[PDB]
């Protein structure tokens, strides 16, 4: 069923809450035993958001390999993503260790450091060229190279140095700065423009490791980003684009991380974004 007609049907009948609850009921439940170990309590931002054991990212260290991060591997679309929480004061070194070890080219950030008067993640990158950051626990140095501030997003060039080997790499930071404190955006136009800028950079492409994408918990806004990207790519690849079923793609993604798409309003917004974005993919 053409999703655009499915959309009008749900909207006229006002059944978004019913649709969303069906997804919650059918979603996978896999163990997350490592996340719940006592030694990892200060590595988790939210007690009810944890990576599954089977898909979690492991740090390359014998001490403690745990980070709240999951690998979402989309087999038909040939895309992979790492979804993670906003870094905590005690996990900023782990975060950049993961970026290094997984060979990522881009980091996608969909929240502000402060929202609703409360801290939603650490200030984990440097704000001035001449004031670099050193993470002593993981032996990394991070330097701000340049910054381009636009009306709806900011792009930063960063240099990450492995102090153990003196290798350096360029990382691109894509920061969507205008998601509202409450609710979802009224139009998907600026979110889609942002997605296309990330694509254009190479950060989503198979010559690099998976992009790292986060918000505060790494399931709501972050899930909207990867769901929209994968659905649009499938509409490009298939003979019949109207065969792409956004609810089925979301359930596949929830095999790899719990809770993706947090509200019925985020589900509706994801539909709107794919419908409007398809009016570029299909050639208009």
From Swiss-Prot:
Binding site for substrate: 181, 215-221, 262
Predominant place of localization: endoplasmic reticulum
Residues with PTM Phosphoserine: 50, 242-243
Active site (catalytic residues): 215 (phosphocysteine intermediate)
EC number: 3.1.3.48
Sites of the N,N-(cysteine-1,S-diyl)serine (Cys-Ser) crosslink: 215-216
Modified residues (Cysteine sulfinic acid (-SO2H)): 215
Keywords noted in UniProt: Acetylation, Endoplasmic reticulum, Hydrolase, Membrane, Oxidation, Phosphoprotein, Protein phosphatase, S-nitrosylation
Catalytic reactions on record: O-phospho-L-tyrosyl-[protein] + H2O = L-tyrosyl-[protein] + phosphate
Positions of post-translational S-nitrosocysteine modification: 215
Tissue: Expressed in keratinocytes (at protein level).
Chain positions with Phosphotyrosine modification: 20, 66
Membrane topology designation: Peripheral membrane protein
Keyword Secreted: no
Entry-annotated residues carrying N-acetylmethionine: 1
GO biological process, one term: negative regulation of PERK-mediated unfolded protein response
Protein localization: Endoplasmic reticulum membrane
Cellular component GO terms held in the UniProt record: cytoplasm; cytoplasmic side of endoplasmic reticulum membrane; cytosol; early endosome; endoplasmic reticulum; endosome lumen; glutamatergic synapse; mitochondrial crista
Cysteine persulfide PTM sites in chain numbering: 215
Modified residues annotated as Cysteine sulfenic acid (-SOH) in this record: 215
One GO MF term: protein kinase binding
Family note: Belongs to the protein-tyrosine phosphatase family. Non-receptor class 1 subfamily.
Protein function: Tyrosine-protein phosphatase which acts as a regulator of endoplasmic reticulum unfolded protein response. Mediates dephosphorylation of EIF2AK3/PERK; inactivating the protein kinase activity of EIF2AK3/PERK. May play an important role in CKII- and p60c-src-induced signal transduction cascades. May regulate the EFNA5-EPHA3 signaling pathway which modulates cell reorganization and cell-cell repulsion. May also regulate the hepatocyte growth factor receptor signaling pathway through dephosphorylation of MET.
Known partners and oligomeric status: Interacts with EPHA3 (phosphorylated); dephosphorylates EPHA3 and may regulate its trafficking and function. Interacts with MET. Interacts with NCK1.
Protein name (database record): Tyrosine-protein phosphatase non-receptor type 1
Organism phylogeny: Eukaryota, Metazoa, Chordata, Craniata, Vertebrata
Segment of the intact protein contained: 1 to 284 of 435
């Amino acid at each position: 069923m053409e999703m655009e007609k499915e959309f009008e049907q749900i909207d006229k009948s006002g059944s978004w809450a019913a649709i969303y609850q069906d997804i919650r009921h059918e979603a996978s439940d896999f163990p997350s035993r490592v996340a719940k170990l006592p030694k990892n309590k200060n590595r988790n931002r939210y007690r009810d958001v944890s990576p599954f054991d089977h898909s979690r990212i492991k740090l390359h260290q014998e001490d403690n390999d745990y980070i709240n991060a999951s690998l979402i591997k989309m087999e038909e679309a040939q895309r992979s993503y790492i979804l993670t929480q906003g870094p905590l004061p005690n996990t900023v070194g782990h975060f950049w260790e993961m970026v290094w070890e997984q060979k990522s080219r881009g980091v996608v950030m969909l929240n502000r450091v402060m929202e609703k008067g409360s801290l939603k993640c650490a200030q984990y990158w440097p704000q001035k060229e001449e004031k670099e950051m050193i993470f002593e626990d993981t032996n990394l140095k991070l330097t701000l190279i340049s910054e381009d501030i636009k009306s709806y997003y900011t792009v930063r060039q960063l240099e990450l140095e492995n102090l153990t080997t003196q290798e350096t790499r360029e990382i691109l930071h894509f920061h969507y700065t205008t998601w509202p404190d409450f609710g979802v955006p009224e139009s998907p136009a600026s979110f889609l423009n942002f997605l296309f800028k990330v694509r254009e950079s190479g950060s989503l492409s198979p010559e690099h490791g998976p992009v790292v994408v986060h918000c505060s918990a790494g399931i709501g806004r972050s899930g909207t980003f990867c769901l929209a990207d994968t659905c649009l790519l499938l509409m490009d690849k298939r003979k019949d684009p109207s065969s792409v079923d956004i609810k089925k793609v979301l359930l596949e993604m929830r095999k790899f991380r719990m809770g993706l798409i947090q509200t019925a309003d985020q589900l509706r917004f994801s539909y709107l974004a794919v419908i409007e974005g398809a009016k570029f993919i299909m050639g208009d």
